[PDB]
Amino acid sequence: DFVVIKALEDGVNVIGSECLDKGEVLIAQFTEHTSAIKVRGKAYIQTSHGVIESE
Amino acid sequence: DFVVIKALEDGVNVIGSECLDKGEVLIAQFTEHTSAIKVRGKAYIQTSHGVIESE
Amino acid sequence: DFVVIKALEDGVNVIGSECLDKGEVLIAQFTEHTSAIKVRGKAYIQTSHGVIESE
Amino acid sequence: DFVVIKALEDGVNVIGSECLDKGEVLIAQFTEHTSAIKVRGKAYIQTSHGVIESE
Amino acid sequence: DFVVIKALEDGVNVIGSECLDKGEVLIAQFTEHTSAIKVRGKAYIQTSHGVIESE
Amino acid sequence: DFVVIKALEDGVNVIGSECLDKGEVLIAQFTEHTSAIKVRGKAYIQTSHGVIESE
Amino acid sequence: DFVVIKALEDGVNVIGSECLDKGEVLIAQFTEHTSAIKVRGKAYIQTSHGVIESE
Amino acid sequence: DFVVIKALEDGVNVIGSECLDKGEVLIAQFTEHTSAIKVRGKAYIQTSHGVIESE
Amino acid sequence: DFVVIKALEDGVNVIGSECLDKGEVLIAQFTEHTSAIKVRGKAYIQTSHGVIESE
Amino acid sequence: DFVVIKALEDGVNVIGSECLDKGEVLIAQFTEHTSAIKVRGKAYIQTSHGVIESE
Amino acid sequence: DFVVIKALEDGVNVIGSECLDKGEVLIAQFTEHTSAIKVRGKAYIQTSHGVIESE
Amino acid sequence: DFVVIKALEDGVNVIGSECLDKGEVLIAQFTEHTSAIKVRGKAYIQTSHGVIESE
Amino acid sequence: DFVVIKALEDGVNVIGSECLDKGEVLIAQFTEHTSAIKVRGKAYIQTSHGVIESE
Amino acid sequence: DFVVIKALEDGVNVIGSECLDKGEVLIAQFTEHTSAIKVRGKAYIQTSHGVIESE
Amino acid sequence: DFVVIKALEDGVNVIGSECLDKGEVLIAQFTEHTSAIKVRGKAYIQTSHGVIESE
Amino acid sequence: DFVVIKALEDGVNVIGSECLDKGEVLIAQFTEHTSAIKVRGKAYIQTSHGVIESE
Amino acid sequence: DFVVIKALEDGVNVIGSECLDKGEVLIAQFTEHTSAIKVRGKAYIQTSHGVIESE
Amino acid sequence: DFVVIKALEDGVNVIGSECLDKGEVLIAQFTEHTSAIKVRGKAYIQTSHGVIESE
Amino acid sequence: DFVVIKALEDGVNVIGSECLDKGEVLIAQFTEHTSAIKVRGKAYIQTSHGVIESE
Amino acid sequence: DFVVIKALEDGVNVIGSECLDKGEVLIAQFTEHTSAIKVRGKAYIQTSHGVIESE
Amino acid sequence: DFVVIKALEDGVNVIGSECLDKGEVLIAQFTEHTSAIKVRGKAYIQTSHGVIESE
Ligand SMILES: [Au+]
Ligand SMILES: [Au+]
Ligand SMILES: [Au+]
Ligand SMILES: [Au+]
Ligand SMILES: [Au+]
Ligand SMILES: [Au+]
Ligand SMILES: [Au+]
Ligand SMILES: [Au+]
Ligand SMILES: [Au+]
Ligand SMILES: [Au+]
Ligand SMILES: [Au+]
């Protein structure tokens, strides 16, 4: 599957180590290499299980 | 799966680095090469998890 | 899967570069070659995620 | 999957290049060869995504 | 999948070229050979996408 | 899949050429050989797409 | 899949040729050999498509 | 899949030839060897198609 | 030897699985394959041992 | 042995598929190929077991 | 065995294709080649099963 | 060449042994096997030499 | 070519040695074996050269 | 040569087994395989020998 | 081609040495062996060149 | 030989599956592949046997 | 054989794809490659079967 | 066969590309190479189908 | 075939390059070499299609 | 080099044999195969040597 | 060399088959493959020979 991360503030880090500014949206698929995704800062995540808001 | 990006303003960048003008719609499938999609600017994205609005 | 594009005005371009007149409907499947579809002009798209209206 | 095209007027062209008269119904499956189907004229199409009316 | 055709009048042609009389029902599966089914005359078709009435 | 045919009158023919009397029920699976099933006479058929009544 | 036949009267024949008495229940799976099941007499059948009552 | 048989009385026979006393529950999966299960006596069966009561 | 079956009503089954309508007469010889003949419905049988009337 | 069929009306069919007119008599022996003889229409049959009248 | 045909009128045809005039008698044995004998016209046949009169 | 036989009454025999009902028309070509055609009953024959009426 | 012989009376002999009854019509082609045809009795012959009446 | 069959009513059978509706015209050539053509129902046939009307 | 000789009196000789009685008709084809045909007595000959009357 | 089809109305189908509009004329020769030609709709056909009008 | 097409107006298309102006005449023979000739526009065709006028 | 073209005015082109002056006559046979003949200008053509006048 | 050219004036050229004086007649057959014949001057030509007068 | 042909009227022929309608423009380069270009009808040609107007 | 086509209206076709909308400009070079360029619709072309306006 895949996750959808909308960065609600600048400098949101996404560690597979990408960085997003405010208003961007990263749609990330899971690979063999990427087995865990850690999200820092204020962001809005949509997964298959629902939505969540990281701070 | 695939995502649907409607560009609501000109010069929306979609990084696999394509560019869209206002009113166009890009339907993008995920491949081996494209494991992450970053969307800049004002756009309206529909995924399997729902809809979202990048700015 | 596949998408359904109803061209609501003449000269709608669909880039895999086909062109549609007003009232036609193109049902397009995704292949290995076609990994992204860009739709210009005024058209009405139905996907699995729902409907959308390109301008 | 497959699509269902009911030709609501005579001479409806379906390009894989078959022709239908008024009142006939063509149920078409997707193959390796048929990756895109274009429908001309007035017809009523049922897909998995719903129904649509080509003109 | 498969389709269900109830012939509501005599002489309904089903082209894979079978003929049905009034009241019969043909349940037809899709094979490699049968990639398209055209139905003439007055008949009542049930597919996975729903029902339709050919004339 | 499979279909369920309840013969509502005597002498119902099912062509793969079996015959059913009134009140019997034949549950028929699709094989490589059986690609089409034609039902004559008055019978009540349940498929995955729903129910239908052949006459 | 599989079917569930509850014999509501004695001597119910199930042809793959088994016989059931009143009150017994036979749960039958489909194999390569068993491609069609014919049920005689008064019995109550549950399939994936629903329930039915053979007489 | 699998079936769930609750024996509501003593000496319930389950033929693949196991015997159950009153109050026990046998959860039985289908194998290559077990293609048909016959249940005698008073028992309460849950399948994927629903519940039924053998007598 | 051989048997003579006059079908006195429609749909008489003769299992070696042939079907006879009312008024027809089947004269059947015994082969290596046909070692037993079962007659259903109302029919009038003449054998070497005499006549009999199946119902 | 052999059977004697006197056709009492026109168009009597004898299936081994010969046809007889009214007043003709066919005396038919049993061979390896002909193991069963079915008689349609109105005819008068004499066998070793006696006489019979097909209708 | 053998049959005895007395031709009671001229031009009686006997198909194994011999022709008899009035008053002649043909005694015919059954061979491998002659497995069925058809008699036209007015004739009087004696077999082992008795006598009969073809017209 | 070929002949055209219109059967003006039922049970018209055409020996190459086909049978025709009233109103049917058989157009028969000559082959190596079919060197002579005999027509019984009431029929209307058109050949290259003209027409004729068999009775 | 071929000849058309309508037998106007019973027992008409045609020697290539076939026999015709009254009202039948034999259409005979010429082969390597059949180099001459002799017609006895009352019959009506159509050839390419015209018609003739044998007695 | 070839024949021309105009079907004057629905469901006209042409056996070489094709079926024609009312108003259609089949022009059929003779091959090695097709040595005889039988026409059922009401139809209007033109051959080299002239025209005829099957019923 | 072929000739048609109707013998108008008894004992008409046809030398290829056949003999005809009064009323018979011989239709004779030309072969390699038969290069000349001489007709004696009273007879009526039809050829492709017309008719003639030998005496 | 060959046939001449003048399409008197739009959408006339000619099955060897070509389509003609109103006023066009198709002159079709017979090949090994094309052994039968079926004409639908209103058209005016000239053959060697004459003219005919399909509807 | 061959056909004669007189183009009565400009731009008459002849598909084997040649084009004719008003007043020209094309005499076309049939080859192995050219098995069907379609004529558009207003033209005057002479064949062996007669004349016709395409529009 | 062959065609006869009388050039009624100067500079008549005949494309197989020959040119004729006024009063000359070209008699042209059809070969393997010449499968179609186009005639320009004012000329008078005689074919087997009749005469025609190109302009 | 062959053509007949009567030279009605002196010096008539016939190109296969022969010359004719007034009153002579040349009867010319078509060969492999002579595929076209051009006639100059005043002459009177008879072909199979009829007569014509070159000037 | 190359030439520019603007077709000022319909049906302008350009022989290398292409056809142009009114208002179209063909820009044609010279190849090894195309050593001469002939222009019919009313057209406006621009070359390196200047412009010209064909009629 | 190369040509410059400014599309002055929508849907201008350029056949080497590309399509241009109003206001776009295509600068096209000549290759081995592209030896001729045909321009439809209203467009403004600049070549080395000057400018021209296709309609
Ligand atoms: Au950062
Ligand atoms: Au376009
Ligand atoms: Au039919
Ligand atoms: Au039993
Ligand atoms: Au039956
Ligand atoms: Au006889
Ligand atoms: Au018959
Ligand atoms: Au003699
Ligand atoms: Au069509
Ligand atoms: Au010239
Ligand atoms: Au043209």
mmCIF file with all atom_site columns, C-alpha atoms and ligand atoms in Angstrom, chain Q residues 11 13 19-21, chain T residues 11-13 19-20, ligand 11:
data_model
loop_
_atom_site.group_PDB
_atom_site.id
_atom_site.type_symbol
_atom_site.label_atom_id
_atom_site.label_alt_id
_atom_site.label_comp_id
_atom_site.label_asym_id
_atom_site.label_entity_id
_atom_site.label_seq_id
_atom_site.pdbx_PDB_ins_code
_atom_site.Cartn_x
_atom_site.Cartn_y
_atom_site.Cartn_z
_atom_site.occupancy
_atom_site.B_iso_or_equiv
_atom_site.pdbx_formal_charge
_atom_site.auth_seq_id
_atom_site.auth_comp_id
_atom_site.auth_asym_id
_atom_site.auth_atom_id
_atom_site.pdbx_PDB_model_num
ATOM   1  C  CA . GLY Q 1 11 ? -13.634 13.213 -56.523 1.00 0.00 ? 11 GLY Q CA 1
ATOM   2  C  CA . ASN Q 1 13 ? -13.169 7.277  -54.886 1.00 0.00 ? 13 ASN Q CA 1
ATOM   3  C  CA . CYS Q 1 19 ? -9.611  8.974  -57.342 1.00 0.00 ? 19 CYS Q CA 1
ATOM   4  C  CA . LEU Q 1 20 ? -11.401 10.097 -60.505 1.00 0.00 ? 20 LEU Q CA 1
ATOM   5  C  CA . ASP Q 1 21 ? -12.525 13.487 -61.761 1.00 0.00 ? 21 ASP Q CA 1
ATOM   6  C  CA . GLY T 1 11 ? -9.126  17.767 -56.119 1.00 0.00 ? 11 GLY T CA 1
ATOM   7  C  CA . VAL T 1 12 ? -5.668  19.063 -56.991 1.00 0.00 ? 12 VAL T CA 1
ATOM   8  C  CA . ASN T 1 13 ? -3.491  16.135 -58.049 1.00 0.00 ? 13 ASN T CA 1
ATOM   9  C  CA . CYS T 1 19 ? -4.703  14.592 -53.841 1.00 0.00 ? 19 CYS T CA 1
ATOM   10 C  CA . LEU T 1 20 ? -5.386  17.876 -52.047 1.00 0.00 ? 20 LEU T CA 1
HETATM 11 AU AU . AU  V 2 .  ? -8.803  13.186 -55.497 1.00 0.00 ? 11 AU  V AU 1
#
